[PDB]
């Protein structure tokens, strides 16, 4: 019961690498949404500042 052990480890490590990339893309997308939402929040506040 060792021929599958080599298969389980390689499939696991490949899955980890793909999950790393997904987490990086999630953090990047959340960072972009935060910036625009806040940059659009000040555009609305300053609009009340000129009215």
């Amino acid at each position: 019961l060792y021929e599958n052990q080599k298969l389980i480890a390689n499939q696991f490590n490949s899955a980890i690498g793909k999950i790393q990339d997904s987490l990086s893309s999630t953090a990047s997308a959340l960072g972009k949404l935060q910036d625009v939402v806040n940059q659009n929040a000040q555009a609305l506040n300053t609009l009340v500042k000129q009215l």
């Binding site: 499939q11 972009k32 625009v36 009215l51």
Partner: protein, 34 residues
Amino acid sequence: DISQINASVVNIEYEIKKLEEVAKKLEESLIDLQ
């Protein structure tokens, strides 16, 4: 004055598309033996 007001737009299509292709490519990592 108010003519200078400008709201930014988001572009996260790369990240969105990346999450669903990795979700598909993760299928290729399931174990199949006996």
